[PDB]
Amino acid sequence: NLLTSLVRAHLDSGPSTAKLDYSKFQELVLPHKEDAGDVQQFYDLLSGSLEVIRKWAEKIPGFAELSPADQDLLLESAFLELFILRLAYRSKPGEGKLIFCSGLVLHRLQCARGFGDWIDSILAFSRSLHSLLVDVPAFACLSALVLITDRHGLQEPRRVEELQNRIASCLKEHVAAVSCLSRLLGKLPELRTLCTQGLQRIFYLKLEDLVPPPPIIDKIFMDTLPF
Amino acid sequence: ANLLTSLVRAHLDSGPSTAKLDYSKFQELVLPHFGKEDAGDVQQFYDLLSGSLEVIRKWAEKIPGFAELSPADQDLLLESAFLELFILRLAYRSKPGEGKLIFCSGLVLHRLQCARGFGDWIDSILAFSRSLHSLLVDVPAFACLSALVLITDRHGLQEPRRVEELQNRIASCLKEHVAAVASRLLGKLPELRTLCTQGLQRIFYLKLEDLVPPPPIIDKIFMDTLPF
Ligand SMILES: CNc1nc(C)c(-c2ccnc(Nc3ccc4[nH]c(C(=O)NCCCN5CCOCC5)cc4c3)n2)s1
């Protein structure tokens, strides 16, 4: 029932296989490495997930019973990790095909310019995720475990740990019912490292300042830098 | 010129002699775990940056007129040019055909000993060293250009006019020197700007990772150069 709730929240947070949008998709991308249009698209694809990941989190049983300050800190801290995990899972790295939570489908070369090298690190992680063959219930727990985790400055870190423990127990109980758990849990630290390169990319783009990040992305960037 | 002689004296006294080179840490083939670093690699990176800053401070003090600029303008010019000057002097000093980095202390390090602390940036600096060496910039021309990288317009100068006059004088000194032995050297100054950005990206990464914290003086240059 926790599991059922987590699966409901996951499946309601992404596009139906029918609401997929191939109208912008380019099978072969023309030759011709960074313009204002590329930076705008990068911030737009990031910003497309903000509202979606907040509504998903609010359907995680227990999440709305954390303090409003802890809810905000967990969302800000996990935003990039959750954006990458959900993109990695949804996408088709065998075809270099990125599927965004709007249902927009883009080839890697159509967003490489905004993303920089990071998009190739994200596709490598997507290919490693796909090889584990994570079933939707397992992924509905894992994604919740990315958000519901210790972060510096939590008001009720013990209640965050207890909710994490419940979701971890829900996941272990599910993987047993169908060494493989620890390969799943192994993807969490890899996701943390991957999203360091996301923070590196935003730093570079703010230095370059072709187009500034929209306020909410800028705040996540500034707030998650320990300095 | 008298200015030229002073600029050449300041330049030559700010690095090692082909005789005061410490091969004491040099190893032609180390075997590193690439794309990773330990506390020792990050501390040495910051130590080389700190040593270069102290050396570039004494060098600037010997540029005639620099020490009479306001103390605040001296600090702003040094902070704003530091990374540019570190890269330019390292590229000019180094031996990229042997993968040899030569630091202002005279310390010689192989490319492979620098890869852990510096990351990609050390390989981009050696590529710039190859482009610089193929221009065959004579010592006096380099002693002028390096001074022109420091003594330039910056946002927040108290006496921008005195900095422009000193710039004007060093430019005149340089033009009258190239004429005295008779634009390509100055088309790699944008390449040098890119290498500064890479330097800032590497410090950002290392501050994120925080194995050891940056020295306060380097940290201030980093924070003061970022518009945010
Ligand atoms: C602004 N002030 C300054 N300017 C600089 C850069 C300074 C400095 C401080 C100490 N030593 C030196 N100079 C130095 C020392 C040793 C050197 N060896 C060579 C050399 O062999 N090259 C030949 C060029 C051909 N390529 C090199 C080999 O790999 C590829 C081909 C130059 C050199 C310069 N400068 S303080």
UniProtKB/Swiss-Prot annotation, chain A:
The chain's coiled-coil residues are: none
The post-translation modification note in this UniProt entry reads: Acetylated by p300/CBP, acetylation increases stability. Deacetylated by HDAC1.
The NR LBD domain sits at 1-224
Q: Identify the tissues in which this protein is expressed.
A: Fetal muscle and adult liver, brain and thyroid.
Q: Where is this region: AF-2?
A: 213-224
The record's subcellular locations are: Nucleus; Cytoplasm, Cytosol; Mitochondrion
Name which cysteines form disulfide bonds.
none
Quaternary structure (record): Binds the NGFI-B response element (NBRE) as a monomer. Binds the Nur response element (NurRE), consisting of two inverse NBRE-related octanucleotide repeats separated by 6 base-pairs, as a dimer. Interacts (via N-terminus) with NLRP3 (via LRR repeat domain); the interaction is direct, requires binding of NR4A1/Nur77 to NBRE-containing dsDNA and lipopolysaccharide, and leads to non-canonical NLRP3 inflammasome activation. Interacts with GADD45GIP1. Interacts with STK11. Interacts with IFI27.
Main function: Orphan nuclear receptor. Binds the NGFI-B response element (NBRE) 5'-AAAGGTCA-3'. Binds 9-cis-retinoic acid outside of its ligand-binding (NR LBD) domain. Participates in energy homeostasis by sequestrating the kinase STK11 in the nucleus, thereby attenuating cytoplasmic AMPK activation. Regulates the inflammatory response in macrophages by regulating metabolic adaptations during inflammation, including repressing the transcription of genes involved in the citric acid cycle (TCA). Inhibits NF-kappa-B signaling by binding to low-affinity NF-kappa-B binding sites, such as at the IL2 promoter. In the cytosol, upon its detection of both bacterial lipopolysaccharide (LPS) and NBRE-containing mitochondrial DNA released by GSDMD pores during pyroptosis, it promotes non-canonical NLRP3 inflammasome activation by stimulating association of NLRP3 and NEK7.
Name the family.
Belongs to the nuclear hormone receptor family. NR4 subfamily.
State the protein's name: Nuclear receptor subfamily 4immunitygroup A member 1
Organism of derivation: Homo sapiens
Instruction: Point out the gene that encodes the protein.
Output: NR4A1
User: Which residues of the intact protein are shown?
Assistant: 363 to 598 of 598
